C-alpha cells in the first residue's frame, strides 16, 4: 500500500473553501481516517461502506472507484492552520498506512495593512526587530547573514478586538546591526514604517 | 485512564544507551499500536498486539527494537544501544471493538552523541515600542528562548499570574543557531500583543515561561556546568506608563 496526499503543502487566504487530497494504491480500504497534527486528533472516520462523514467545517468523501478519499474545508480559518494526514486500514490488517502530510497555512485577512519595522529593548543594551503588520501577500525572508537571526512569520489573533496580524523577528550581537537593514532580505512594502529613536 | 497516555514525552539519549517507551491504552483496550514518525512525514506502522500476542510486527527494524505487552495492559516500546537515526516521534494508539484507533501525545526522542550537547535556554523579554504604542495604540511583547538543545521545550505568557492565549503567536518551528553547520542549538520567538492602555498599567506583570525537558537524576554528567535538568528558565516585564 502507497498513500498519496497531495498538495504537501497548501497556502489559502482565509474565508476560501479547500481541498486535500488522499489516494491510494491499493483501493481494499476497510476504515480511512483524516488527523490533525499541530500527537494526533481524530477528526473523522470512513467505513468500507460510507461514501462520507463530517465533523463542523471538515467533510470527508471516499471514492471506492477512483480510490481517492477529499477532505473539504469549508469558510478555512487561521485556526485551521496545521498539518492534516490521511490513513487507511486495507481488508484483511489491522495497522494504518498514512500519507506524508499536507500541510495547511490558512492566511489572515488583514483588513488594514499597516507595515512597520519596530524596535524593542530587553526589560533587564539588547534589543530585537520587529516587523508587524504587514499584509499576508508579504512573506518573510530567512536571513543571508549566519549571525543575523530572523523567524518565519506569525500569526496572532487578538480576539477581543476583531484582529489579526503578522510578525517576523530579528536580532543579532553584531555591531553594525539596525532595524533599518535587518529585513533586507525580504519583499518588504514600500510604504514600511521606520520609526525615528 | 479515558485517554492513551505515553511516558516519557520527551526523552534525550546518549548514542549507545538503551530506552524504554511506555503506552497506557485506554482502559481495557484490546488492541494496541506502535507508529514511529520522522519529522515532517507521516507516522509508519511498527507493532500491533492483540491482547499479549504481538500479531503483527512487520514494521520493527530487523534489530535493537523490541515491543513488549506482557499481561495485555501497559506496552514498552525498548530501543537497545540507540542510534541518531532512531531520532523521532513515536505514537501508540489503542483501539476497542469499533476498530477505531485513538492515539497518545507520543514520546519525542532524540538521540545525540554525548549529552555534553544538552542546553538549556536563555530567555529575554523584550518591551514594547513607544512608536508602536504610539502609531498603533498596542504593544506588542517579544521572549525569546536562545542556545537550547534538544528542540523540547513549551514557551507560555503570563499575565499577573493568568496564562494568556489571546494575542500571542509562538514560532511554530525554532531556527538554527548555527545554520551551516549539521550541529546546531537552537532558539525560538514568541509575541504578546496588548492594548497599549493594558502595557501603560505599571501594576500589570508579564511573565514568559520556558519549560525544557532535559537530563534526569539518572544521567550522569561530568561537565564542569550545571547539570542541564528539566527546569523552567523564565523572563518578565512590568508595565510602564
Known sequence: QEVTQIPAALSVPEGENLVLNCSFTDSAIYNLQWFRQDGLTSLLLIQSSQREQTSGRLNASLDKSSGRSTLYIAASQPGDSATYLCAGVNTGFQKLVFGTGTRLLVSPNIQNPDPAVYQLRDSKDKSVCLFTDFDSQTNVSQSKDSDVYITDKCVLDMRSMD??????????????????????????????????? | ?????????????????????????????????????????????????????????????????????????????????????????????????????????????????????????????????????????????????????????????????????????????????????????????????????????????????????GLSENDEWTQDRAKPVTQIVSAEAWGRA
Not at chain 1, 163 to 183: G, H, L, Q, R, T
Open chain 2, 1 to 213: 485512564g479515558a485517554g492513551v497516555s505515553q511516558s516519557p514525552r520527551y526523552k534525550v539519549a546518549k548514542r549507545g544507551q538503551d530506552v524504554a517507551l511506555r503506552c497506557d491504552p485506554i482502559s481495557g483496550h484490546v488492541s494496541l499500536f506502535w507508529y514511529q514518525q520522522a519529522l515532517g512525514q507521516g507516522p509508519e506502522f511498527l507493532t500491533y498486539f492483540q491482547n499479549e500476542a504481538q500479531l503483527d510486527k512487520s514494521g520493527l527494524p530487523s534489530d535493537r527494537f523490541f515491543a513488549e505487552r506482557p499481561e495485555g495492559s501497559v506496552s514498552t516500546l525498548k530501543i537497545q544501544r540507540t542510534q541518531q537515526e532512531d531520532s523521532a516521534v513515536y505514537l501508540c494508539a489503542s483501539s476497542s471493538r469499533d476498530l477505531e484507533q485513538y492515539f497518545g501525545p507520543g514520546t519525542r526522542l532524540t538521540v545525540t552523541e554525548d549529552l555534553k550537547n544538552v542546553f538549556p535556554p536563555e530567555v529575554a523579554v523584550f518591551e514594547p515600542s513607544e512608536a508602536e504604542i504610539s502609531h498603533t495604540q498596542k504593544a506588542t511583547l517579544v521572549c525569546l528562548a536562545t542556545g537550547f538543545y534538544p528542540d523540547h521545550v513549551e514557551l507560555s505568557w503570563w499575565v499577573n499570574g493568568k496564562e494568556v492565549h489571546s494575542g500571542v503567536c509562538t514560532d511554530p518551528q525554532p531556527l538554527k543557531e548555527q545554520p551551516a553547520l549539521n550541529d546546531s542549538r537552537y532558539a525560538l520567538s514568541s509575541r504578546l500583543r496588548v492594548s497599549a492602555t493594558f502595557w501603560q498599567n505599571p501594576r500589570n506583570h508579564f511573565r514568559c515561561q520556558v519549560q525544557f525537558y
Open chain 1, 163 to 197: 484582529f489579526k496580524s503578522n510578525s517576523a523577528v530579528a536580532w543579532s550581537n553584531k555591531s553594525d546591526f539596525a532595524c533599518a537593514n535587518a529585513f533586507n532580505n525580504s519583499i518588504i512594502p514600500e510604504d514600511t514604517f521606520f520609526p525615528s529613536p
